[PDB]
Structure formats: C-alpha cells, structure tokens
Design a protein around this motif. Structure first.
Motif, PDB file in Angstrom:
ATOM      1  N   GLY A 117       7.135  24.276 -22.884  1.00  0.00           N
ATOM      2  CA  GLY A 117       5.697  24.309 -23.055  1.00  0.00           C
ATOM      3  C   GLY A 117       5.029  25.057 -21.921  1.00  0.00           C
ATOM      4  O   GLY A 117       3.882  25.488 -22.031  1.00  0.00           O
ATOM      5  N   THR A 118       5.764  25.220 -20.831  1.00  0.00           N
ATOM      6  CA  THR A 118       5.283  25.959 -19.677  1.00  0.00           C
ATOM      7  C   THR A 118       6.355  26.954 -19.228  1.00  0.00           C
ATOM      8  O   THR A 118       7.435  27.009 -19.821  1.00  0.00           O
ATOM      9  N   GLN A 119       6.069  27.734 -18.192  1.00  0.00           N
ATOM     10  CA  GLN A 119       6.976  28.794 -17.757  1.00  0.00           C
ATOM     11  C   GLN A 119       8.161  28.248 -16.961  1.00  0.00           C
ATOM     12  O   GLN A 119       8.999  29.011 -16.488  1.00  0.00           O
ATOM     13  N   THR A 120       8.228  26.935 -16.806  1.00  0.00           N
ATOM     14  CA  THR A 120       9.371  26.313 -16.155  1.00  0.00           C
ATOM     15  C   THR A 120      10.343  25.750 -17.186  1.00  0.00           C
ATOM     16  O   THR A 120      11.241  24.972 -16.865  1.00  0.00           O
ATOM     17  N   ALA A 121      10.156  26.171 -18.429  1.00  0.00           N
ATOM     18  CA  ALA A 121      11.035  25.781 -19.519  1.00  0.00           C
ATOM     19  C   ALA A 121      12.388  26.466 -19.384  1.00  0.00           C
ATOM     20  O   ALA A 121      12.449  27.682 -19.186  1.00  0.00           O
ATOM     21  N   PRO A 122      13.484  25.703 -19.487  1.00  0.00           N
ATOM     22  CA  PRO A 122      14.836  26.246 -19.362  1.00  0.00           C
ATOM     23  C   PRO A 122      15.157  27.236 -20.472  1.00  0.00           C
ATOM     24  O   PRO A 122      14.780  27.029 -21.627  1.00  0.00           O
ATOM     25  N   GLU A 123      15.847  28.314 -20.106  1.00  0.00           N
ATOM     26  CA  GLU A 123      16.216  29.361 -21.054  1.00  0.00           C
ATOM     27  C   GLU A 123      16.981  28.788 -22.233  1.00  0.00           C
ATOM     28  O   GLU A 123      16.656  29.048 -23.392  1.00  0.00           O
ATOM     29  N   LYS A 124      18.013  28.021 -21.926  1.00  0.00           N
ATOM     30  CA  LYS A 124      18.893  27.494 -22.948  1.00  0.00           C
ATOM     31  C   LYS A 124      19.029  25.989 -22.776  1.00  0.00           C
ATOM     32  O   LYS A 124      19.140  25.493 -21.651  1.00  0.00           O
ATOM     33  N   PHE A 125      19.004  25.265 -23.883  1.00  0.00           N
ATOM     34  CA  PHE A 125      19.172  23.823 -23.853  1.00  0.00           C
ATOM     35  C   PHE A 125      19.733  23.323 -25.181  1.00  0.00           C
ATOM     36  O   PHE A 125      19.420  23.865 -26.241  1.00  0.00           O
ATOM     37  N   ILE A 126      20.578  22.307 -25.115  1.00  0.00           N
ATOM     38  CA  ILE A 126      21.138  21.694 -26.311  1.00  0.00           C
ATOM     39  C   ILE A 126      20.802  20.211 -26.342  1.00  0.00           C
ATOM     40  O   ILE A 126      20.746  19.560 -25.300  1.00  0.00           O
ATOM     41  N   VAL A 127      20.562  19.681 -27.532  1.00  0.00           N
ATOM     42  CA  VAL A 127      20.180  18.285 -27.674  1.00  0.00           C
ATOM     43  C   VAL A 127      21.195  17.518 -28.522  1.00  0.00           C
ATOM     44  O   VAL A 127      21.648  17.998 -29.564  1.00  0.00           O
ATOM     45  N   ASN A 155      31.088  25.720 -14.130  1.00  0.00           N
ATOM     46  CA  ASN A 155      29.623  25.808 -14.042  1.00  0.00           C
ATOM     47  C   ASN A 155      29.019  26.771 -15.077  1.00  0.00           C
ATOM     48  O   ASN A 155      28.592  26.337 -16.149  1.00  0.00           O
ATOM     49  N   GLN A 156      28.998  28.069 -14.771  1.00  0.00           N
ATOM     50  CA  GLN A 156      28.448  29.062 -15.688  1.00  0.00           C
ATOM     51  C   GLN A 156      29.251  29.106 -16.982  1.00  0.00           C
ATOM     52  O   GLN A 156      28.693  29.303 -18.054  1.00  0.00           O
ATOM     53  N   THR A 157      30.561  28.912 -16.875  1.00  0.00           N
ATOM     54  CA  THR A 157      31.449  28.946 -18.033  1.00  0.00           C
ATOM     55  C   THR A 157      31.043  27.903 -19.079  1.00  0.00           C
ATOM     56  O   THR A 157      31.234  28.104 -20.274  1.00  0.00           O
ATOM     57  N   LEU A 158      30.469  26.803 -18.610  1.00  0.00           N
ATOM     58  CA  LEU A 158      30.109  25.687 -19.476  1.00  0.00           C
ATOM     59  C   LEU A 158      28.993  26.079 -20.435  1.00  0.00           C
ATOM     60  O   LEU A 158      29.093  25.869 -21.641  1.00  0.00           O
ATOM     61  N   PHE A 159      27.935  26.651 -19.891  1.00  0.00           N
ATOM     62  CA  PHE A 159      26.718  26.861 -20.666  1.00  0.00           C
ATOM     63  C   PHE A 159      26.431  28.341 -20.935  1.00  0.00           C
ATOM     64  O   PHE A 159      25.792  28.679 -21.929  1.00  0.00           O
ATOM     65  N   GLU A 160      26.890  29.220 -20.055  1.00  0.00           N
ATOM     66  CA  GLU A 160      26.589  30.641 -20.187  1.00  0.00           C
ATOM     67  C   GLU A 160      27.798  31.424 -20.680  1.00  0.00           C
ATOM     68  O   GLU A 160      27.710  32.131 -21.683  1.00  0.00           O
ATOM     69  N   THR A 161      28.911  31.279 -19.952  1.00  0.00           N
ATOM     70  CA  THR A 161      30.136  32.063 -20.151  1.00  0.00           C
ATOM     71  C   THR A 161      29.827  33.529 -20.495  1.00  0.00           C
ATOM     72  O   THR A 161      29.679  33.908 -21.660  1.00  0.00           O
ATOM     73  N   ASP A 165      26.036  35.919 -25.855  1.00  0.00           N
ATOM     74  CA  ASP A 165      26.237  35.231 -27.126  1.00  0.00           C
ATOM     75  C   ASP A 165      27.727  34.985 -27.284  1.00  0.00           C
ATOM     76  O   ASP A 165      28.537  35.813 -26.860  1.00  0.00           O
ATOM     77  N   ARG A 166      28.100  33.851 -27.851  1.00  0.00           N
ATOM     78  CA  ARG A 166      29.506  33.534 -28.023  1.00  0.00           C
ATOM     79  C   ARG A 166      29.719  32.487 -29.098  1.00  0.00           C
ATOM     80  O   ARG A 166      28.886  31.605 -29.303  1.00  0.00           O
ATOM     81  N   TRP A 167      30.833  32.633 -29.800  1.00  0.00           N
ATOM     82  CA  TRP A 167      31.311  31.647 -30.751  1.00  0.00           C
ATOM     83  C   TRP A 167      32.814  31.522 -30.570  1.00  0.00           C
ATOM     84  O   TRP A 167      33.490  32.536 -30.390  1.00  0.00           O
ATOM     85  N   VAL A 168      33.330  30.292 -30.589  1.00  0.00           N
ATOM     86  CA  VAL A 168      34.759  30.045 -30.352  1.00  0.00           C
ATOM     87  C   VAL A 168      35.086  30.363 -28.883  1.00  0.00           C
ATOM     88  O   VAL A 168      36.239  30.554 -28.489  1.00  0.00           O
TER      89      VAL A 168
END
Length: 188
Positions: A117-127, A155-161, A165-168
C-alpha cells in the motif's frame, strides 16, 4: 541430528495431487524438539489472496482493473488461524516479522497490511494459511532413507534464485535431480 532444518528445503516433487503447476513446496521454517515446522505439504485452496482481503475489511487495495488474483495455499493443518506471508528485504521497515534468515522475513500479524500500500511494500511475497508440523526427529530419518532430497537454501536461493522468473527451480537448484521418490515398489 541435522544442524537445524531451518533455511533448508526438501525436493518432493509430487505426481500431481490437486496441484497442477502453480508452485509446490518452498522451505522448512524451523527444527525443534517439539517437532519440525515447515510448509511442504502442498495444498492450494480455491480462495485468492486479494479475495479474502477485499472480502473482509481490506476492501481498498490495488488490484486495479486487472481483476486477476493469486490463489492462497494452506501451509498445513496447524496454525490455520493465521496467514503467514513470506517476503524478501524491502527498504527498512520491520514491526511484526519473524527471522527465517537475514533477507527472508516471515510476517503474519498486522505488519503485512502495513507493508503493501506504500513504497515500503516488499517486491515479492507469498502467503500460506497455517503450517505443517512433522514428527520430532522423524523427518531426519526419512531423509536418511533418501526418500527426501535435502538441499540448503542460501538466502537469495530461497526466494530469488537468480531473480527473474523460475519454475521447477527447487529441482534445478541441485541440477535436475530425479529418482529416489517414485519407485513404485510396494509389494516385493
């Protein structure tokens, strides 16, 4: 034993089982004497993340005229009372977040509504609603059977890798590993 299953992930790769293609398994939350907390059960719901938000009391969001949404998954039969949002580092906000690792922050109570809702919103998030708790020390033995493919999430491998974009990606992290899961040798 295993030096903390937190920050690790296990490659299951289900045949299908309700899910079709839209993200399957992510990581283990923690490893305690009381049990092993993780979100690897895989069970998506027919409800959408923005659906529940706008339906309750978060009506004024920013979905725009796209109307498209993201489906919310159940993380397990435990902690179904709360929706857990895993997100990456973004700016310097932090009110109600639990440390999974340095960049990965687990936010479930209130703070997530403050985030987007603001500019401190995380780029990527999963719920995920709830989480799964495995039997104490059991998963360790199951991994020892080579029934589960254990790999660490750097660390980065977990959420960014690589971050694009990535699948599998979980299966690719090791190098396209197969075998040791589907054997089909039950009666023998």
């Amino acid at each position: 034993m295993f030096g903390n299953l937190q920050g690790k992930f296990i490659i299951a790769t289900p045949e299908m089982d309700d899910e079709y293609f839209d993200r399957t398994v992510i990581y283990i939350c923690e490893h305690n004497d009381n049990g092993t907390i993780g979100v690897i059960i895989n069970t998506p719901t027919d409800l959408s993340v923005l659906e529940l938000l706008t339906r309750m009391d978060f009506q004024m969001a920013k979905p725009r005229i796209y109307t498209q949404d993201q489906m919310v998954l159940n993380g397990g039969p435990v902690n179904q009372d709360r929706g857990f949002i895993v997100h990456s580092k973004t700016d310097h906000e932090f009110t109600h977040s639990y440390k999974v690792t340095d960049d990965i922050t687990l936010t479930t109570s209130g703070d997530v509504l403050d985030s987007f809702g603001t500019q401190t919103a995380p780029e990527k998030f999963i719920v995920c609603l709830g989480c799964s708790t495995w039997k104490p020390h059991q998963l360790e033995q199951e991994i020892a059977q080579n029934y589960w493919l254990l790999s660490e999430a750097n660390n980065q491998t977990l959420f960014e890798t690589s971050y694009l974009d990535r699948w599998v990606e979980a299966n690719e992290m090791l190098g396209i590993s197969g075998i040791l899961a589907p054997a089909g040798r039950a009666l023998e």
